[PDB]
Every structure is written in C-alpha cells, then in structure tokens.
RNA sequence: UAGCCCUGAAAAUGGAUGGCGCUGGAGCGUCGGGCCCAUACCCGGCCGUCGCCGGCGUCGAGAGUGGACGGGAGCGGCGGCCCGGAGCCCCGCGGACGCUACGCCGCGACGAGUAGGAGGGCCGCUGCGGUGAGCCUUGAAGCCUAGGGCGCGGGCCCGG
RNA sequence: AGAACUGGCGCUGCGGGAUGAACCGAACGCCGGGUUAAGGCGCCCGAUGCCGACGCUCAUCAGACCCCAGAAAAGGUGUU
C-alpha cells in the first residue's frame, strides 16, 4: 500500500479529478502571487516617485 | 465517556483517514483498499462504486451510511505525536476524554 | 396500533405512488433553525453571592 | 491487547478422514477436486460425508430407500448414500431402482440385481453425473443407535424417559424407590 | 571457491546463544539440556527481567534459511557409493557427510566418487594417512 | 475547568427548547472566561442551571463567540468579584488587578487565588468584572502605580544562567 | 475570616522527602512550551497458530464468464476485368521450476498463563517383525574435547 | 469479623509508585524504526543546560506528589 496525499498517481488511480483539482490550484496561487507581488511594487513605486 | 474521545470531524479529517488509513472487509479480512475494484465489487450494489463516492456517504451521512461504514475496518491509528493531557479526566475538566466537538480535528492530524 | 396504521398507510401510497418510509427512526439531531431576538436584548445573568 | 473472548475460534469439523483406507482416500482425492472445481453443493455434501465417522455414517435399509424413492418425481433418479445398504427381510418385492453407495451388502446387492436394478460406486457416479444432477441423496437414521436412548436429562428427573444403565433387566434391578409411589416417591 | 551452491541468502538466526537450563551453572548434576521449569515460585517460568530466557516458537529461523550450513549447503550423511549417487540431482543445494562409522579404506572411494559427480562433502580430509 | 494558559472571554447566549407551554423562551446572556469554546459552552450550563430551570438536554446555545477588548493598548484597572470555596466554608471577595486587557486580569486572578488561598480553578466563580477608574480603587498595590512621573530603578539584576558558559573566570556583576 | 510558617508535638541500636542535598527554589499553589521511555500504539522483517482459499489445465497450444454451423438476404475489409474466398502452425521441430495431493502456494487476523485438557515430535531409551546387496579389526560400542556446525527446543551430526 | 456490585490478585510478566501480591498505566511470539501512557526531567539517573510566567513561605522540629506508611482540639501584634 502506497500513500495517497503523499505521492501522485496513487491518488490518480483512485481519484482522477485530483489532478485537475491540483493544477487548478497551482495555477491560481501562482497568479494570486503575481497579483500581490505587483501590488506591493507598483504601490511603493509611486511612493518612490514622490520622494 | 471515560474511555473514548470524540467530536465532529471536518472534510479533510474524513479525507485523511480514508486515503491514508483506509482499509476494507470484503468477507472477513482487512485488505488495503488500493483499487476502485475493491469498493465496487463489494459495495457497488449501493451506487457507491469508487473511493470518493465512498467518502461522500460518510461525510454527508447519506442513505447508505450503515453499509459503507461497516465496510471500513476500524482505523488502527498511531499514538499521538504531541502527547495527551491527563487521559483520565474530561476535556472540559482539563484532560481529554470526551466530546471536544472540533478540536478532535487537531487530534486526528497528530494521530494520523 | 402501528401494524394497523402501517398497513392502511402502506396501500395508501401504493394507490398514489410515493416513498413514505414507514420504518421509524430515533430522535435525529436538530434542524438548522433560525432563532429570533426581536427588539429586546438577551438578559444578562450572573452568579449570586454566598449567604447562610 | 484487543478483546475479551473465550477463544472458540478453532472450527472442530473434519478436514480429512482418520481412516487410513487407501481406497477411501482415492474417493476423497476424487471429490475434493470436484468440490473446489465444479460449483455444485452436491459435491460438498458428499465430500463432507466421506470425512465422517462410522457412527455419523449410519446404514440405510433397503426398505427406506424404496420408501423414500416412491415419492412423486423420484422415479428415474439415483439413490446416493455415503454408507452401507443392508436389506430388509420385511420387504417382499424390490423395484428396479438405480443406487450408489460405499459398500452394499451381499444379500441386498443380490436382490437389487434380480429386480433389474444397478449398483454404482462413487467413481462411476462421478463419470455419469459430475454435478450430481438427477440424484436423490439419502441418509440412514443416525439417531437410530441404542446409545441415544441413554442420552437425555437424567433417569431420576421428572418426565425424563432416559433408560438407565442396568447390568440386567428384571425385577429387583432399579425398580423400588424413585420408581413407584409406594416405596418413597415416584420421580 | 571449491564448489559453490545455488543462490545463498544472508543467514540471520534470531539468537546464537544456545538456551541453557536454569540452576545449571550452580550444580554439576544438572546438565545444560533445556527442560522447562514447572515450579510454582520460580522467577524464570514467571519470566522476570534480567534472567534466563526460555525458548518458544518466536525464535524459529526463516523457512528458506532453516538448516542451511554456513557455506550455504544443506548436509545429508551418506555411508557408501550407492546412496551418494542419490544426491546427483541435488549437488548445488544439498551436500554430503561421510558418517563416523565408515572406515578409512571405504572413505577413500566415496570422496573420489563425489569429486566426479561434483557433490561437496564437508569432511573430505577425515581419517587419512 | 483547568484554566490553562491565558484565559479567553466568551459571550454565550442560549435558550431552552420551545415547549407547548412557552413558545419563545427569553434567551439569556452570559460572560464566560474560559480557555476555549468547548469549556465555555460547558460552563454556560453550569451557571444557568444554578439560576434558572435550564439544563443542556432541555436547552441549546444559539451563539458562543469570543468577545475581546476594545482597547488592548490602554492600561486599565480591573476590580472583580469572586465566590471561592475554602476548606471550611465559602467566601465572597472583592479583588483588584491592573492589566492591558479584560481577559488577562481574570487570568491573573486564578494565578493569584491559587497562590494566596490554594483555591483551585474549579472551586472559584467570577461574579462580575469591570474596568474601574482611579479614586474608586481600594487596593494599595494597585493604587501605588497611579502616579504621574512614576520612577524606580531595577536593583540586583539576575538572569541567563548556563546559557552563558557554565564555567568562566568572571564574577557576574548585578549592576 | 483563611493561605503558608510556628506553638501544641515525648521512646527506647545510628538514620532516612530514596539518598546527596535544595532557600532568586531542587519548597508550596496555579499554569505554559519543549523534552525522557514500556513487552502499550503505528509501519516493516521473521516464526508459529487459527481462519479463508488456490492449483489434477505439465494444456508451448489451453485460450473459454454465452458459443455453433448451414442453409434465404446484407454492409465494411481483403487480391478488378463493378463479378470473385480458409489457408489446417512453421525460415528455427523448440519452450525454465513444479503437484511426498498426508505435498505445494496465496491472503488476513491473532500469540500471557497455574491447576487441567488436547495436538505434533525427522525428540530420546530397550527389545521384535520387515528392510537398507547398511556399517565396521584399513577399528564397533563406550568415554573425553578451548575442534566444526545444525535445530525455537527435546536433541543430533561431524573432527580429533 | 461478615455480606452486595464490579474489577483485580491467585494464574501475570512489563513502565511507574525508591522498596513492594492487590495502587497507577498497560497485558506479553522474535526484532528494527517511530510515537506515547502513568510518571517524570539539580546530581545519583534517560530527560528543563527553558535568559519559563504569577504569587506565597524562614522553621533553633522547614517543606517535599493517589493507595502510603505519622497527628488533633486550641492559639500567634509571624507574615499574606
Ligand atoms: Mg506463586
Ligand atoms: Mg482509575
């Protein structure tokens, strides 16, 4: 017995939706990362434009 | 109530116990439930022919809760890696032996 | 009594085509209801002092 | 530790005969092959009776076999018994039935064959009917033994009917007190 | 390097210390042959800690490794040429012993026969001149 | 209760189940100081069953939420009312503290009733708690810190033993 | 009024929070975070037992959980002068182990024990019937051994 | 000394209670890794060698951890 929640494709032999559940959540927390990294820069860039 | 610890499990407590400590009884033995052919062959009479259809009838208590639960072997859990508090009095009283109603999910994540 | 009011209710749905489920269940956990506290406020009570 | 059982949990049936008869061992190797390979419950009942004791395999008289095969429907089936067929003197005529047994006796197998019958063994039963199809399997009276009428509650118990162990039946041998209302009591 | 068997596994043994009888250190009338002690107050039957361990079925060695010699063969003692030719079809798993009875003249012929059939004998240099 | 760590305030309201005799029971409110929201909804039924004919089988709580302070950064004065049990009898007691927050003053009380009176956390009931102002305080340990331009030094400082080298050639000066 | 300490408070060998000892605690109360370990719990290896079975198909030709033929009509795919029909092993003659069936193989759960009860002994002793074309004066039995090992053990084999 | 209910000891090792029949944890095939239970972590003696938190307490008889192995009424302008 191998461990689902620990290796891929033992999840996917048991639950095929767990792959597209996983790249739908690696995509969106890669774009929420970009949405917050660009927000922290472009706010304090205009702050750096003043002083 | 002196001898058990219980409470109300959430959705990845009921998921972490099936995918990691999940075991079945077809006739009389505990098999590792590796394939969906091990749920469908013994319990596909009830429309619940796979693994997450097994987990849907045990989180939301459905019409076929009795046969899906009695299919699962009782979870042979490890000893808790935090340690227990006092083990002999109630969770209200300071110990941990009773109903804790959602803190049981903090305990499953150390038992499992 | 509930072999009488079961068999007259068994054929009562046979002629009407439903799924009455005449087997009894014990007391279920309570429904997700919605209490009302209309206008007033919940009354504050405190433990009284000790006297003989 | 796990539970508080009394440990029954060793099933106390028989898995092979205690008999060292090599002909009877060949029947077991014939039928424990058939029992695990033919998906019939005839070959599970015949296989578990080849295991059984001489006490649990009682004889069957030739008059019960023709009494239990003059029933409606049984006219062209086979008589199967894992046990011996002694004849009844009491019966007058014999039909032309087809039988199958371990060990039919000498007078009984003369009377079946005069009447046109046919004796089989379990070998040529298996080649005729492997599934056991078209068979009437019978048994003798296993509580027909004299041993079973000493078995019961206790002879002195009221309403017992249990036949005590006496070395000689007669007057003065276990008839005085506890057996009649005059001498003490009746049980 | 002389005559090598088939595949030899690693022989574990669970214990290599030869179960000795209780109170046998203390008396010379008591041999070291294990008898289990059926006394009422003794502390070895009652299995106290730090004392003489008593044998049971848990020490049993692996089924594919039981009765293996440390060379990887499994002995079978012979007496003459004709029951040494019964071992021709087992020469890579089973080996021969010449028994303690067989004289030094007959031992010469059944060790030089096992050279031809390529059967290992564990005592080939016994009772020589 | 054990009163483990810092405590935590809870607003626990609840009503008894609607009978044929009384639809809409009045749904009382309490103020529970407890380590978590399982002991808090347990101690709600300890005090409500002392005052009304309510008990947990014939009642339900409708809200148990953590009420926290509205000024964590403001130094306040908390005088509280107690009902502890002693070895001989039981006593009523007023008792002041002084803390940034409401929930930490009652933590400081259990640490202090156990210290000065050996009173375990089960044999002690909290009647009421409020922030009081200066000139309404009675206790001089609390009153002496009511001092504009308060000043004191730290005499005879000692700390950090064995974390430094356990063997040194240097006698540690206590300032 | 109640926490701690004190008085009340005296026993016979020298002595006992276990001892040494401890007073910004190694004391008492209330608690926090780490950390230490049982034959307990979990995962793994092995032994045995219980349970449930598998394999007579050694069938390199068995191919099979619905298959026939063969007739009256039809579409696809194959080799055309829009008409058409079985090829049965072969260029290699080949293809591991196995099933003491009282034996082999699999899977799962279990394992404390007095009195007591059963099972197995390829444990051991003495004699008898059979049997090893057994074994030996080129050395039997017996006894000795810091010699080589085997079996969970009873014990056994070998070397001198 | 004699009963009731349940568990245990006798028949039972193991961790802890220094010591031990019965207390507390836990029951046991032979071992490796992990984690805990009761109990603990100055040094015997594994682990607080944490920059642990708040208080109380001075004894010329201090106190010190279920069973459990030593105390009462009464009293103190001793301290809180
Ligand atoms: Mg004893
Ligand atoms: Mg208890």
Swiss-Prot record, chain C:
Keyword annotations from UniProtKB, A to Z: Cytoplasm, Disease variant, Endoplasmic reticulum, Hypotrichosis, Ribonucleoprotein, Ribosomal protein
Keyword Cytoplasm: yes
Disulfide bonds: none
Compartmental location: Cytoplasm, Cytosol; Cytoplasm; Endoplasmic reticulum
Regions of compositional bias (Basic and acidic residues) in chain numbering: 6-17, 30-39
Record region (Disordered): 6-39
Lineage top rank: taxon: Eukaryota
Predominant location: cytoplasm
Keyword check for Endoplasmic reticulum: yes
GO CC aspect terms: cytoplasm; cytosol; cytosolic large ribosomal subunit; cytosolic ribosome; endoplasmic reticulum; membrane; synapse
GO MF terms, alphabetically ordered: RNA binding; structural constituent of ribosome
A Gene Ontology BP annotation from the UniProt entry: cytoplasmic translation
Disease named in the record: Hypotrichosis 12: A form of hypotrichosis, a condition characterized by the presence of less than the normal amount of hair and abnormal hair follicles and shafts, which are thin and atrophic. The extent of scalp and body hair involvement can be very variable, within as well as between families. HYPT12 patients have normal scalp hair density at birth. Hair loss begins during the first 6 months of life and gradually progresses to nearly complete loss of scalp hair. The remaining hairs grow slowly and are thin, sparse, dry, and fragile.
Function: Component of the large ribosomal subunit. The ribosome is a large ribonucleoprotein complex responsible for the synthesis of proteins in the cell.
Subunit structure: Component of the large ribosomal subunit.
Stated family: Belongs to the eukaryotic ribosomal protein eL21 family.
Protein's name in the database: Large ribosomal subunit protein eL21
UniProt source species: Homo sapiens
Gene: RPL21
Shown residues within the full chain: 107 to 158 of 160
Curated annotation (Swiss-Prot), chain D:
Residues bearing the modification Phosphoserine: 129
Function: Component of the large ribosomal subunit. The ribosome is a large ribonucleoprotein complex responsible for the synthesis of proteins in the cell.
Pfam families given in the database record: Ribosomal_L18
Biological source species: Homo sapiens (Human)
Top-level taxon of origin: Eukaryota
Comp. bias (Basic residues): 160-170, 177-187
Gene: RPL18
InterPro entries according to UniProt: Ribosomal_eL18, Ribosomal_eL18/eL18-A/B/_CS, Ribosomal_uL15/eL18, Ribosomal_uL15/eL18_sf
A single Gene Ontology CC term: cytoplasm
Protein name listed in UniProt: Large ribosomal subunit protein eL18
Protein's cellular compartments: Cytoplasm, Cytosol; Cytoplasm; Rough endoplasmic reticulum
GO molecular function, a single term: RNA binding
Modification type Phosphothreonine: residues: 157
Cross-link (Glycyl lysine isopeptide (Lys-Gly) (interchain with G-Cter in SUMO2)) at residue(s): 118, 163
From Swiss-Prot, chain E:
Phosphoserine: residues carrying this PTM: 61
Modified residue annotations for N6-succinyllysine: 49
Localization annotation: Cytoplasm
UniProt KW Electron transport keyword: no
GO CC terms: cytoplasm; cytosol; cytosolic large ribosomal subunit; cytosolic ribosome; membrane
One Pfam family here: Ribosomal_L32e
A biological process from GO: cytoplasmic translation
Keyword Lipid biosynthesis: no
Annotated SUPFAM superfamilies: Ribosomal protein L32e (SSF52042)
Gene Ontology MF terms: RNA binding; structural constituent of ribosome
Main location: cytoplasm
Protein name as annotated: Large ribosomal subunit protein eL32
Curated annotation (Swiss-Prot), chain F:
GO biological process terms on file: cytoplasmic translation; translation
Location relative to the cell: Cytoplasm
Function: Component of the large ribosomal subunit. The ribosome is a large ribonucleoprotein complex responsible for the synthesis of proteins in the cell.
Taxonomy, superkingdom: Eukaryota
Phosphotyrosine PTM positions: 63
Principal place of residence: cytoplasm
Protein source organism: Homo sapiens
Keyword Glycoprotein among record annotations: no
Key words of the record: Cytoplasm, Isopeptide bond, Phosphoprotein, Ribonucleoprotein, Ribosomal protein, Ubl conjugation
Modified residues (N6-succinyllysine): 76
Name the record gives this protein: Large ribosomal subunit protein eL20
GO cellular component: cytoplasm; cytosol; cytosolic large ribosomal subunit; cytosolic ribosome; membrane; postsynaptic density
Covalent crosslink: Glycyl lysine isopeptide (Lys-Gly) (interchain with G-Cter in SUMO2): 11, 128, 170
MF-aspect GO terms: RNA binding; structural constituent of ribosome
Gene3D superfamilies noted in UniProt: 3.10.20.10
Phosphoserine modifications at: 71, 123
Keyword Cytoplasm attached: yes
Subunit structure: Component of the large ribosomal subunit. Binds IPO9 with high affinity.
Family under the similarity heading: Belongs to the eukaryotic ribosomal protein eL20 family.
């Amino acid at each position: 017995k191998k461990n689902p929640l620990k290796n891929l494709r033992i999840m996917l032999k048991l639950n095929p939706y767990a792959k597209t559940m996983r790249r739908n959540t690696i995509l969106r927390q890669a774009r929420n990362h970009k949405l917050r990294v660009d927000k922290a820069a472009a706010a304090a860039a205009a702050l750096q434009a003043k002083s | 109530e002196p001898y058990i610890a219980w409470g109300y499990p959430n959705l990845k407590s009921v998921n972490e116990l099936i995918y990691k400590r999940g075991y079945g009884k077809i006739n009389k033995k505990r098999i590792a439930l590796t394939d969906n052919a091990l749920i469908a062959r013994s319990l596909g009479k009830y429309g619940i022919i796979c693994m997450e259809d097994l987990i849907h009838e045990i989180y939301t208590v459905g019409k076929r809760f009795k046969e899906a639960n009695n299919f699962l072997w009782p979870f042979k859990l490890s000893s808790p890696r935090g340690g227990m508090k006092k083990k002999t009095t109630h969770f209200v009283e300071g110990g941990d032996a009773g109903n804790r109603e959602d803190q049981i999910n903090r305990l499953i994540r150390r038992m499992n | 009594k509930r072999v009488k009011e079961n068999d007259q209710k068994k054929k009562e749905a046979k002629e009407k085509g439903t799924w009455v489920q005449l087997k009894r269940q014990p007391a279920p956990p309570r429904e997700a209801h919605f209490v009302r506290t209309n206008g007033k406020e919940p009354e504050l009570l405190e433990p009284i002092p000790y006297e003989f | 530790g796990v539970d508080i059982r009394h440990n029954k949990d060793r099933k106390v049936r028989r898995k092979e005969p205690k008999s060292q008869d090599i002909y009877l061992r060949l029947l077991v190797k014939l039928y424990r092959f058939l029992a695990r390979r033919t998906n019939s419950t005839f070959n599970q009942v015949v296989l578990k009776r080849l295991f059984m004791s001489r006490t649990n395999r009682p004889p069957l008289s030739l008059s019960r076999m023709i009494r239990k095969m003059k029933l409606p429907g049984r006219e062209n089936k086979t008589a199967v018994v894992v046990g011996t067929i002694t004849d009844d003197v009491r019966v007058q005529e014999v039909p032309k039935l087809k039988v199958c047994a371990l060990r039919v006796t000498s007078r009984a197998r003369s009377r079946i064959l005069r009447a046109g019958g046919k004796i089989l063994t379990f070998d040529q039963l298996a080649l005729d009917s492997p599934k056991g199809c078209g068979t009437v399997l019978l048994s003798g009276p296993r509580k027909g033994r004299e041993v079973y009428r000493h078995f019961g509650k206790a002879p002195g118990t009221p309403h017992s009917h249990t036949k005590p162990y006496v070395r000689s039946k007669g007057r003065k041998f276990e008839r005085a007190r506890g057996r009649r209302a005059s001498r003490g009591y009746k049980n | 390097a002389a005559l090598r068997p088939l595949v030899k596994p690693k022989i574990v043994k669970k214990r290599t210390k030869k179960f000795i009888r209780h109170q046998s250190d203390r008396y010379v009338k008591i041999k070291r042959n294990w008898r289990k002690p059926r006394g009422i107050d003794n502390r070895v039957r009652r299995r106290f800690k730090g004392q003489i361990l008593m044998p049971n079925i848990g020490y049993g060695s692996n089924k594919k490794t039981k009765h293996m010699l440390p060379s990887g063969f499994r002995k079978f003692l012979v007496h003459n040429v004709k029951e040494l030719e019964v071992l021709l079809m087992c020469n890579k798993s089973y080996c021969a012993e010449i028994a303690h009875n067989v004289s030094s003249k007959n031992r010469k012929a059944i060790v030089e026969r096992a050279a031809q059939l390529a059967i290992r004998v564990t005592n080939p240099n016994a009772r020589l001149r | 209760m054990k009163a483990s760590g810092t405590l935590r305030e809870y607003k626990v309201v609840g009503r008894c189940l609607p009978t044929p005799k009384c639809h809409t029971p009045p749904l009382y409110r309490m103020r529970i100081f407890a380590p978590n929201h399982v002991v808090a909804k347990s101690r709600f039924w300890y005090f409500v069953s002392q005052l009304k004919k309510m008990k947990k089988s014939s009642g339900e709580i409708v809200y148990c939420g953590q009420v926290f302070e509205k000024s964590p950064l403001r130094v306040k004065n908390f005088g509280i009312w107690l009902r502890y049990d002693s070895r001989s009898g039981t006593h009523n007691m007023y008792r002041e503290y002084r803390d940034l927050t409401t929930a930490g003053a009652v933590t400081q009380c259990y640490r202090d009733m156990g210290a000065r009176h050996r009173a375990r956390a089960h044999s002690i009931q909290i009647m009421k708690v409020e922030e009081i102002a200066a000139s309404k305080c009675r206790r001089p340990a609390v009153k002496q810190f009511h001092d504009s331009k308060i000043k004191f030094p730290l005499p005879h400082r000692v700390l950090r033993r064995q974390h430094k080298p356990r063997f040194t050639t240097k006698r540690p000066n206590t300032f």
